[PDB]
C-alpha cells in the first residue's frame, strides 16, 4: 500500500507536467488523477525499468528511474485518490 | 482529427476491459475516459509498435496491432470526449 500524504509531497516534482491536481494542462502529458492505483504502480515501474519507449516516454523514464518502490506506491495512492474530474 | 462516432462504434471491442464508459472495473486495466486525446493516440501507437513492455503491456499490445491509424484517431477522440467521472 502507499502513503497518500507522502505521495502528495513527492508529487511536487510531478505537478509541473501532470498538473497540481493530476489533470494535465498540456495535451501531450497524461492526466493521472483518479487513475487505477495498481495500474499507476505498474506504469511507474515500467518507466523506471526502461520498459516504455516511443514518443515522449524517454522524458517520463527520466522522471521515474530515481523513484524508490515506496515512492512509486505513495505516488500511485496519491494520484488514484484524487477526483478524476477535479 | 478523430471521428467520435466511428470511435464509439469501434469501442465495442474495448469496453469489456476499459468499461462501457471508459472507467474500468478491473484494477489493472486503466481508465480511458476524459484522458488527453493526443496522449491516447500516442499510447495506442506505442502498443501497436511493441513499444510498451512489462506487466500487462503484452495483453494490450495484442489488442492494438489490428488497429489502423484511423481506428486509433477515432478511439482517442471518443475516449477523450467521455466525462472522466462517468
Ligand atoms: C514532464 C517533464 C514530466 C514530469 C516532471 C513527470 N512526467 Fe509523468 N509523464 C510525462 C510524459 C511525457 C508521459 C507520457 C509518456 C509516454 O509513455 O508516452 C508521462 C507518463 C506518466 C505516467 C503514465 C500515465 C498513463 O499511463 O496513463 C505516470 C504514472 C506518470 N507519468 C507519473 C509521473 C510521476 C508520479 C511523476 C513525478 C515523480 C512524473 N510522472 C513526472 C511527463 C512527465
Ligand atoms: C483487456 C483484455 C483489454 C482490451 C480488450 C483492451 N485493452 Fe487497452 N489495455 C489493457 C491493459 C492490460 C492495459 C495496460 C497495459 C500496460 O501498459 O500495463 C491497457 C492499456 C491501454 C491504453 C493505455 C492507457 C494509458 O493510461 O496509458 C490505452 C490507450 C488503451 N488500452 C486503449 C484500448 C483500446 C482503444 C482498446 C480497444 C480497441 C483496448 N484498449 C482494448 C487491456 C485491454
UniProtKB/Swiss-Prot annotation, chains A, B:
Domain of life: Bacteria
Pfam annotation, one family: Cytochrom_C
PROSITE patterns in UniProt: CYTC
Keyword Metal-binding tagged: yes
Residues reported in the UniProt entry to bind heme c: 14, 17-18, 60
Subcellular location field: Periplasm
Keyword Electron transport found: yes
Recorded GO CC terms: periplasmic space
Alphabetically ordered keywords of this record: Electron transport, Heme, Iron, Metal-binding, Periplasm, Transport
Modifications the protein undergoes after translation, according to the UniProt entry: Binds 1 heme c group covalently per subunit.
Transmembrane segments: none
GO molecular function: electron transfer activity; heme binding; metal ion binding
Subunit (UniProt): Homodimer.
Family label: Belongs to the cytochrome c family.
PANTHER family referenced in this protein's UniProt entry, alphabetically: CBB3-TYPE CYTOCHROME C OXIDASE SUBUNIT FIXP, CYTOCHROME C4
Function: Electron donor for periplasmic nitrate reductase.
Protein's name in the database: Cytochrome c-552
Taxonomic source organism: Marinobacter nauticus (Marinobacter hydrocarbonoclasticus)
Lineage: Bacteria, Pseudomonadati, Pseudomonadota, Gammaproteobacteria, Pseudomonadales
Amino acid at each position: 500500500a502507499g502513503d497518500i500524504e507522502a505521495g502528495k509531497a513527492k508529487a511536487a516534482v510531478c505537478a509541473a507536467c501532470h498538473g497540481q491536481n493530476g489533470i494535465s494542462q498540456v495535451p501531450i502529458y497524461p492526466n493521472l488523477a483518479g487513475q487505477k492505483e495498481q495500474y499507476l504502480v505498474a506504469a511507474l515501474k515500467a518507466y523506471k525499468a526502461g520498459q516504455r519507449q516511443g514518443g515522449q516516454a524517454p522524458v517520463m523514464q527520466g522522471q521515474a528511474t530515481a523513484l524508490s518502490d515506496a515512492d512509486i506506491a505513495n505516488l500511485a495512492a496519491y494520484y488514484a485518490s484524487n477526483p478524476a474530474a477535479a
